[PDB]
Amino acid sequence: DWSTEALYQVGKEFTSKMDLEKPNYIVPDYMPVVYDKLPQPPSHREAIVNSCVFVHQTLHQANARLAKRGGRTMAITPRHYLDFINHYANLFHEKRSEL
């Protein structure tokens, strides 16, 4: 299955055409989800990608915990991550367009 750095790279590449704000963005990140993060304080785009891969990791953790408490869990695949990225792109474009 895809590792954390693969998830970060694919999120970075597919969210490239997302014209993200990149504002001043104070960075009290302190989140070592990916160890190849920029030592200098990451921009808004990279923080969003890190949050995306963190959401995927949290879904995996939730599935593990649910399986612990009596199963009834369904597998999550990289296709789920791709669908999530596509939903992010489409919804962000739609929301920005109407605003």
Partner 1 sequence: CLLSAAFIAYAGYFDQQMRQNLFTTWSHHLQQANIQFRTDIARTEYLSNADERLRWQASSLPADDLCTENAIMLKRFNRYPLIIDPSGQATEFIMNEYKDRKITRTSFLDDAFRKNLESALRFGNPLLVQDVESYDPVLNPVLNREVRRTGGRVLITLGDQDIDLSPSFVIFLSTRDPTVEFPPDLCSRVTFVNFTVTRSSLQSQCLNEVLKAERPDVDEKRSDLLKLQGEFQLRLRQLEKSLLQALNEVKGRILDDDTIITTLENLKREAAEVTRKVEETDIVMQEVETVSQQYLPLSTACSSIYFTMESLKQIHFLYQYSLQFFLDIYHNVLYENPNLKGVTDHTQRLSIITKDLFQVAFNRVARGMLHQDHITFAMLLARIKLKGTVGEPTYDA
Partner 2 sequence: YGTFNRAMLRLIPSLRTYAEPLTAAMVEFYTMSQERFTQDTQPHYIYSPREMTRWVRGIFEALRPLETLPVEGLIRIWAHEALRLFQDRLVEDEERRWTDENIDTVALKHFPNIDREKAMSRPILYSNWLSKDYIPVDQEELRDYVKARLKVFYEEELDVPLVLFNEVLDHVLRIDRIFRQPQGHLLLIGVSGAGKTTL
Ligand X SMILES: Nc1ncnc2c1ncn2[C@@H]1O[C@H](COP(=O)(O)OP(=O)(O)O)[C@@H](O)[C@H]1O
47 is a site residue for partner 1 (CB under 8 A): yes
The answer to whether residues 81 and 56 touch, using CB atoms and an 8 Å cutoff, is: yes
| Residue ranges in 76-95 that form contacts with partner 2 under rule CB under 8 A | 77-80, 82
Residues in contact with partner 1, total (CB under 8 A)? 34
6 is a site residue for partner 2 (CB under 8 A): yes
Distance (Å, whole) CA 49 – CA 22: 13
61 is a site residue for partner 2 (CB under 8 A): no
Nearest CA among 43, 55, 54 for reference residue 18: 43
In the complex with partner 1, the residue whose CB is nearer, 3 or 87, is: 87
CA atoms within 13 A on the CB side of 37: 23
Binding site for ligand X (CB under 6 A): 10, 79, 82
